Amino acid sequence: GNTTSSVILTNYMDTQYYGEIGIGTPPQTFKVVFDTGSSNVWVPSSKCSRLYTACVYHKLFDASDSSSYKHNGTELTLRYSTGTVSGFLSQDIITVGGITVTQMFGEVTEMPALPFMLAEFDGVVGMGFIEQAIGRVTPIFDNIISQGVLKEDVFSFYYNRDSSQSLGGQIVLGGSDPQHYEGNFHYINLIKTGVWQIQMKGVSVGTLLCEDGCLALVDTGASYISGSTSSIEKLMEALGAKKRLFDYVVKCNEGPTLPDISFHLGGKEYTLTSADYVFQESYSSKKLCTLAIHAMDIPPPTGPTWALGATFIRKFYTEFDRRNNRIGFALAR
Numbered sequence: 001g002n003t004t005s006s007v008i009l010t011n012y013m014d015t016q017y018y019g020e021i022g023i024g025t026p027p028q029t030f031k032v033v034f035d036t037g038s039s040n041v042w043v044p045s046s047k048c049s050r051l052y053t054a055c056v057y058h059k060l061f062d063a064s065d066s067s068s069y070k071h072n073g074t075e076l077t078l079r080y081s082t083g084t085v086s087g088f089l090s091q092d093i094i095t096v097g098g099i100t101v102t103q104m105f106g107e108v109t110e111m112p113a114l115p116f117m118l119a120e121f122d123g124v125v126g127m128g129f130i131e132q133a134i135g136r137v138t139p140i141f142d143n144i145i146s147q148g149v150l151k152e153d154v155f156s157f158y159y160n161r162d163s164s165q166s167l168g169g170q171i172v173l174g175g176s177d178p179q180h181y182e183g184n185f186h187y188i189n190l191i192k193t194g195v196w197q198i199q200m201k202g203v204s205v206g207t208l209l210c211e212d213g214c215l216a217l218v219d220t221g222a223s224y225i226s227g228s229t230s231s232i233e234k235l236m237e238a239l240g241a242k243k244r245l246f247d248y249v250v251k252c253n254e255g256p257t258l259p260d261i262s263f264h265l266g267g268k269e270y271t272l273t274s275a276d277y278v279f280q281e282s283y284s285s286k287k288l289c290t291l292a293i294h295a296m297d298i299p300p301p302t303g304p305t306w307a308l309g310a311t312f313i314r315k316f317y318t319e320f321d322r323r324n325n326r327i328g329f330a331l332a333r
């Protein structure tokens with residue numbers, strides 16, 4: 001068709017980006033991460049035991065208050081790199097940026113405190129392909145496309161650096177927003193259909209890693225840039241960063257002096273300065289500052305792979321092109 005549509009996002013502390021969707025009649029509202037690294041939609045269920053504290057603190061979908069609910073009840077387990085959610089399939093009308101779709105989604109009944117007690121979002125809207133969808137459930141974007149309303153088979157992500165009288169982020173469904181990028185889009189083709197993943201031909205500090213070529217997943221649902229444990233260990237040894245439990249840190253004074261990190265993607269060199277990857281919460285030598293780069297071990301067939309999360313998308317406005325199986329990058333502004 002001709003419609004373009006946007007979802008306004010909230011930026012919590014540069015680590016979580018999420019927007020609002022409505023589910024049911026009348027619409028029950030949820031905060032959701034829009035995630036190119038997965039393909040399922042889930043929100044917490046009212047049938048979630050309150051022994052899960054995460055279900056006490058998030059919005060719960062109540063099927064009993066929706067006149068448009070359609071039962072399914074097939075068990076669903078979604079295993080992310082950092083935690084599992086479990087529950088069952090349901091169908092209802094999901095409203096996202098003024099588009100209503102009939103969507104099968106997971107009602108989560110099992111929701112661990114880690115990491116979900118630390119989540120400002122309630123659930124996830126997977127923006128990946130049907131190939132990676134658990135239960136072979138049609139993803140929301142595939143459903144929006146079937147309706148023939150959008151101007152193009154594309155969606156774009158803007159993640160703001162600032163988090164205070166400004167929008168935290170934006171997703172354009174059906175195009176991109178020229179107000180949030182500049183210069184030309186650089187288009188990189190995907191390795192295959194089914195995964196938002198591209199060939200990376202080197203990771204540079206100041207090339208040390210990925211010299212013989214590796215995979216880079218473009219994961220809007222992730223906070224950080226992640227690599228494999230051994231990839232990250234060598235990167236951090238080169239940065240002089242100390243390994244902690246869940247993050248890598250430097251002494252806050254050393255922060256500004258940290259070298260640039262480059263990702264060789266599609267023939268061009270995508271460079272992040274220390275300002276882009278260090279949480280400069282201080283300049284004290286008595287204080288430690290977290291890096292926005294950690295380890296994530298992703299098993300076959302998706303991994304081993306690097307993941308380009310919010311750290312990367314903050315600098316680079318990202319267009320996801322389902323029609324041509326490619327990703328466009330442009331300088332965010």
Ligand SMILES: COCCCCn1c(C(=O)N(CC(C)C)[C@@H]2CNC[C@H](C(=O)N3CCOCC3)C2)ccc1-c1ccccc1
Binds near residue numbers: 118
């Ligand atoms: C942009 O803002 C998004 C913030 C969400 C980041 N995050 C993840 C997370 O990164 N994910 C899982 C999913 C639930 C949002 C990833 C999303 N993409 C799919 C990833 C995955 O499971 N993979 C990678 C691709 O191959 C399969 C496994 C996991 C886990 C926990 C948190 C979190 C972080 C701070 C506070 C509270 C929670």
Ligand SMILES: *[C@@H]1O[C@H](CO)[C@@H](O)[C@H](O)[C@H]1NC(C)=O
Binds near residue numbers: 071072073074
């Ligand atoms: C659940 O959905 C699947 C796929 O659409 C279908 O085969 C099945 O009949 C549904 N089950 C119930 C109990 O509605």
